[model samples]
Target: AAHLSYGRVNLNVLREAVRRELREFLDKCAGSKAIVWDEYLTGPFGLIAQYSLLKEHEVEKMFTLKGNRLPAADVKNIIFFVRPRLELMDIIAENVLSEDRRGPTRDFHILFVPRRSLLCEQRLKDLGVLGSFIHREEYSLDLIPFDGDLLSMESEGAFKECYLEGDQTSLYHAAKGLMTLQALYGTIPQIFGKGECARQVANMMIRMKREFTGSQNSIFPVFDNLLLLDRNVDLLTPLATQLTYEGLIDEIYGIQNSYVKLPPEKFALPTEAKKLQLNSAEELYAEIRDKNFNAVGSVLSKKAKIISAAFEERHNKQFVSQLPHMQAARGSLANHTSIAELIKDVTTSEDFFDKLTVEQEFMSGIDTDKVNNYIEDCIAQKHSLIKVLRLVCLQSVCNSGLKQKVLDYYKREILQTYGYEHILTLHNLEKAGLLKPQTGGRNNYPTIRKTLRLWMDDVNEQNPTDISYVYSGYAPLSVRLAQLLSRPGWRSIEEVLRILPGPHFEERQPLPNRVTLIFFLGGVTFAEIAALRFLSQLEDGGTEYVIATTKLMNGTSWIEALMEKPFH
Candidate 1:
């Protein structure tokens, strides 16, 4: 077995770059200021600046853009940190107008993070709040470090907004983030891309390079390859159920900003709702985050025994000095033990296992009639809309596209059960390529399995020996493609790429290191990350990979993002 190891790449460079940008923004403030932020900026901003750091910079109060009423404050200046979204711009204008009406107006300065949009400015002008701001700037705060090997744009709506809605604004932000990485770590030598957004991002990168000419920094490249992918390229991966320990945690508890909030029912009175951070800083979490769900129990048991032994050793007078170390070990043990128990409870439940079985069957091209029956049952039983939608999408994609009759049946059932308002939801799914009327044969699953070698062939879930083990012996097409790029290169898979419904490209060049960065334009799941990690540890031709995405996603969140709000 390959021993667990974290990548050697330095993440501090990215973190320091963010801190410098934030410090530059803070330096412009003359006195106490209130910060108004877009809701999505909460996680990314926290990663860069702590509450104390903001306080030290004369920030007297903070408020989210969701709030309609502006808080009363004595500060003469108010700073807004937000995305270039129309709704947020309107909120900022409303707040400015409110402050102006209340009493002496504050000096409004808006700082749009990453970049600013012309539309947002026009909206502010239309609201007659353009002249109210003393200054306007772009923070260029893009990629944020989520873990040692992970960075994210934290733009949750990038997928649906770009692919489904045909909005290119988030795509531009994603390209800018890549350029920022290039500026810090030098230009990428090899580039591979698929999908329309990927092609657009490549063009943008070229334009960015040509538009600027200067004495370049001597910074060396840290990555040998860059892979840009659009989430629409492989909708099946996200729609399928995730079974790895971390993936399950995300699917059940939902991981946001590297933290998972356990439900109030999981703990006692005051501790009912507990938020746990999952990152390299937590030694136990780092060890088990990518482990198979079945294997996690054994690992946690082993860790508990070690912690118990350490505590027992403290009985000796000579070991009195080791009390602190023992206490820390004990805490780690208890933390993981509690989490493992919760995971056991959920995974062992009949509902979860039933869903997993259906998902596995869908992946393996087994019993289409049976799977359709299962989905029909889910809708009939009034299961969660998102859950049923996921299975429906999975079935549609796996079969290339559902038959017209089947599609209409699902549509009618959903509309009757959920309401006619969900007709918009079905439209959104079809636009995103998550659902479609049958236009091709039911050969997509077979083709994908053969082309990507998705199955382990010989490995079982209990003793998995392939990267596919990350998803219970079914590999994600994205990870398999990445692995193919490093070994045989894209030329070997030219025919496969050609058959795929997206723009594809490949460029070959020599590099100083084997480090690779795979960026997902929309979002990526923990299951994909686990598969990539497994590929990195292969004995034959392993390569280092850094996973980057617009945001972390799972089946439920991905489907829910495509669902239209009742009123909107």
Candidate 2:
């Protein structure tokens, strides 16, 4: 199978990288003196630290130190890599000064690399360690920054390319950290400002398109604007299903990491063992005495007695039985070409008498009329069974022929229905092909997808509609940016960056000339995947694309776990 990528940095790799960085820093700062390194960073810190030490075994065991007893050595520099929770920071500081004969000195320099702790710098400042501390705020492993010279453009002066200019107030709030980073670190890293993931994905497409379809044009502009649009205003795509095999399974079965459990009875194994063949009369007698537990075996053993009774009923006289002929007829019926033909061929006068006796004994206390009605009801249920089965099968398999084969087998063998009722059911099944079932309640039965209520505030919906129309079909973000980039009005990355709210870039990476978009229709569809794969090649070499979604959907089992409301 081809490797499908989900642009995630491996946790172990991340852990190791941090660990190596910290260790290297310790070695470099320590000069020629040997320094003691903690064998483990435990608790939450350990877990985060382990991101850098994936090869270490039982690292957590090393963090069990209850009290800190630092030897009276001249160790003045301490680097603590952990979340800057007050309690944890105090624990480390307390441990450091616990056994110092000279007592705690304020001259020590402490470097704190807190995990996701933007307030850590201020916390250190408050602790009177402002002049002797270094802290870095990083959102992802790539470490992109907001304001930076790396984004300086030749013609535009600075990259003031704001995507959602009208929403400046909200943008400012969202990018506050970025603004802080800019003040301290200067221009943000070029990588942070650019859409690297989108570009890499688009690059994959360019290669595929050139090798397979001979296209040289990049597909960046179309998908990039589409992504910005989807992310900004029409964000509901993340919650919808795209109707594909892999997608449906994920939505219904929670198949996150490449595993799915087939429905019960679809791959069911029989409970009882088959009767062993007898080699002789003595063996047969022994077998009969022991008795087989299988249903078929039990029924076969009673065939002789049933035949005798049937003979008496037919003759209307106490007559000797012709067991051999009757058993032969039953054997013939069992091997008949089709179940329907077999039932018709074997329901003779004798067969009816035998079957009636069996039915009467099995349904001893039930009213005959009620029993018949119950059977009719079960037969009627076959219609729905066929419909549901077809949907599940279609959603799971992408091949049309295979889908049809499964549907046919379920209808003929499993459904066991016929004529106009069957025809009508099939017709409805085709009509409901695109429809997914939403689970209603505890019973797991699904209702039609269309009937489920999708709530959106009426005024909010109207505003979005109007906004979409006014943007000339472009996503609001793209339209806003296009307008900004179209005109000549910018200075430095800092100046343009100031106009755009939020954290300024401290670092910068070159923007990939190309990009791609994946609409997480909440559910991904196979059709969409195929289309993405095909369209990627019409872009420049630098473009790239990848798939993403809240969930994936398919037609068949989309209704498997139908819920009255979306999952919280």
Candidate 3:
């Protein structure tokens, strides 16, 4: 069982510490014109009550915004820190643009306290303000950066700092994005500053108290123990629990946000070899009079013409061949988009052996034995059909008509033949059991059928068709960059789960009877779905688990989804 810690600190102390630091930092730069701090702090909730209590206590400078928003008091230069999620930054941007006080238009000498050392260089470049800041530093959530002031202050033990390098820096950079910063991973204080930096920071905190006079007068100590709280003990404390929506979508349904190129329904014919040709109209034609273009003629014009004609003919053939593939690819892409849309509308992998089973049944007319043998060869060669089809499906999901046509075809050809009536009866039985027509009508009978059909086909297909294509190899560079930048410490998802305190496989705990768990982060994956399904299966048969991902994905989707892009 996981344990919880209960060490508490006064919120008043924290406020006082912040006040004292601001005063000292300001006093040190008294000669300087202005001081700007990025909006980088997380305040207490219950805005009305909390602010009221703070104000009544004579904390004059601690003013709350009207709607828990940030304030722009036009104090020349204000100091703010960088907070995760960029919520504070958003608030600051809004305040800067508000009518009452149209603050500096990215004009003021801004000091950016980046969350990590490897800041978004591109964004800063795009903003064209990377050089304006006087002092910049890289810090963990503890807000300790390596710089002249910080290093000088370090000797006096004013503030704690963490030094990052190489893999840690890369991991920090990747995980420092808005979503990762707001994630549960960010809340773990222990993970924030580890090894040598932790000791250095602790030493610096002690020194700061002695060197700075403000430390004596400060109501809140900078090294408050309460700041470091157990993140896992109160899993449900974060207002949301479990991984469901967007986070789940990213995991299961690969997000090819920028672009996708699906395989065409028909493959293109290979280009023809160029034939030897001589232009009869050119000066070179006269010199090559002895050469025969055709039979024993004077020039190579005939051969050239024939070759050119063949090229034109083959080009036309390829275009024609690609029509169906394009249509199919578009259809699949549309279906993927529709899955999410349908969820919102309110209206609603393995080797060749696994492949063969589904394909054998789906394409009823295809030669199973021949197809099976072909699939085996492909499998042996590591050729990918599912991979190609996934990209096609992702592209198809974006187009409604194409998606519906594919679904309709599936219904007409595959479902109708494979025990459709029995499935319909099961659905009818479900409808009959329901008490209210209107309420039950909203229930998704079609979705249930689709899920069943998917599983059934997974079971039955003995020889799957080879719809594999080259497009499946196109994962978005952005996503790749995001993943590369967002490197996790754990080797694998399973390893991370094993370390975290949750409903594990070895010692499963019964969940709350009426609990509604919603994963509030990135997209989920099939592996996650499988894990959840397994968990649900272990519990009482009556227990139900609804896994909702932002998108659905697979091995092929990981690559093929990103084929054509304006940027790419």
Candidate 4:
């Protein structure tokens, strides 16, 4: 019954705003438009506007961007909604040329998501089809609201791009996205952040603000503080196992733009896998998403019983009135119970416990300096290379990087077992500071751990009093920094901030307060998201947190991004 009662920022407005802009764009194309989507944009686009929205705009058909000629559609306009990439221009040019040669001539429109690039347009011009398009527009679609409390850029390569390739494109997007948020919620009165990337984004925001053509700051600011955190600042938390229900689900099956595909065995259709959209709109999912996995089973069972009781008793006229509510609740219960059973199957495995044990040990500052036998065995057995890499990275990060010999040994082991293809992946991880050779006197993990209470001796999973319960006993350092930044405030931990990655600074637009937006620069794990929400929900909490990330990430996706392609 403890609803997140504090936040006044309705993320639903962002979604509605996107839909309104999208509808206008579609209406500009007028007569039925057949839309083609960049493969990556499809999921996030669906979140902002569903099929009904498309139908209202007289969209005749939809197709995934493919190499082959698009199927003929009887429509006045053919729209290609794509990211500004040169390679995608080749596909677009081919699609345009093929349609020109064979199909009925339709007005070709290019709608670039977020930003339109001259480079991609040049590619289209190079391919000799730039003149074919009727309309070329930029859709500044950024910061998609994944939930009531969470927003994401859904930019997967931000971490790798910023940290590995030395590209600052994601930082620019972050800055632009921040501008979008401020433009909607009015300018954030105060900005505070730690790490180099966060500092860069903040600087960009200020510069962009100055350049705004006297068209900014009309609405009264809804947000009091913007707390920008670079994911690299607290790399340790994502490496560890996430014990929360939503976190575990993400780890096991992977959540893509808030949609997860579960095995068909637990679903009603035996042949077709169940695809579920997990959002805040679902009351049952909102209640359990951030809960500890250990606590989810009991909640599901309790709901099952409660639903059965309500079904058996045909009580007052209120029962008749609420049958639709009860009906939806029953469906929600079934969906979760089945999903929970699937989670239980995975969580019960010996491999799962072994991974959890190793993670907990690393979190507790145990066996971190040396390569553990468990990692050694996983590599020996040729288990998942990603899993193997994650553990080694965790060990490296927890111990503040491994010794030269220890690092070499693990690298050699990984390369040998998983193949030499992963050599580049190891290098990427090192570049990102997730895996590195130890630097003397640069370690602040132990001190931060003690000061911030990162390792809790015990956590009540069922009724968590602290944010530590998200990871069972480990309070995510990211969330810990967030908790302190709002409470006792970051000034209290000046020494710790110095130890963390980059410069910590703030610009008070004559000061700040109750609602804080924590923006994760690279990516954020579900556990950290949950912990931040827990911080907002607590009794002493004076601030309600709204989270925005470049991507809603888990350990696997973050590591996978850094890995070298084992393919062409």
TM-score of each: 0.93, 0.27, 0.23, 0.95
Would you list the C-alpha lDDT of every candidate in the order shown? 0.79, 0.30, 0.27, 0.86
lDDT tens readout by residue for model 2, 1-568:
0111122211233334545655555444442222223222232233234333422321121222234654443334434444334555555445544645555442233333323455555655565544544333322211111011011001110011122121122122223322222222232222222132223323332333234433233222222322311121211111232222223333334332222443332121544322221111222222221111111234344654665576667667223455555555454334211222322333334633443332332222223111233223434555344233333323322111123344454455433554434444443333322222222322111111111111112212111232122111211222222222222311212333332323311122222333333322123333334334323333433433344332233333333222112222
Q: Could you tell me how far off, in angstroms, the CA of residue 171 lies in candidate 4 after the best superposition? A: 1.9
Residue-level lDDT of model 1, residues 313-348, one tens digit each, is 665475677777777766776777787788889888
Our model 2 lands, by Cα RMSD against the true structure, at: 26.0
RMSD of 3: 28.1
Each candidate: RMSD to true structure? 3.1, 26.0, 28.1, 2.5
Q: Of 3 and 4, which scores higher on lDDT?
A: 4
Report the poorest 10 consecutive residues by lDDT, candidate 3. 151-160
lDDT of 3 by residue, 1-568 (tens): 0001111212232223334444444443333232223322222112112334434333234332222334544343333344322334444344334424445422222323324333343444344544544443332322111110010000100110111111122122222321221221112112112123222322333343234442123122211110111112111111111122222233233333211222322212534322111112222322222111111122233444544565566566465775564554344333333333422332112442344343333222223112234333443454443432332222221111123343334334322333354244223212222111122122232232232221122221111121010011111211111121123422333332332233222111111121112121112233333333323334332222233222233333322222222211
**How many residue pairs clash in all the candidates, one count each?**
0, 62, 73, 0
Candidate 4 residue pairs in backbone clash: none
Off by over 4 Å in 4: 1-7, 100-102, 214-216, 510-513, 566-568
Which scores better on lDDT, 1 or 4? 4
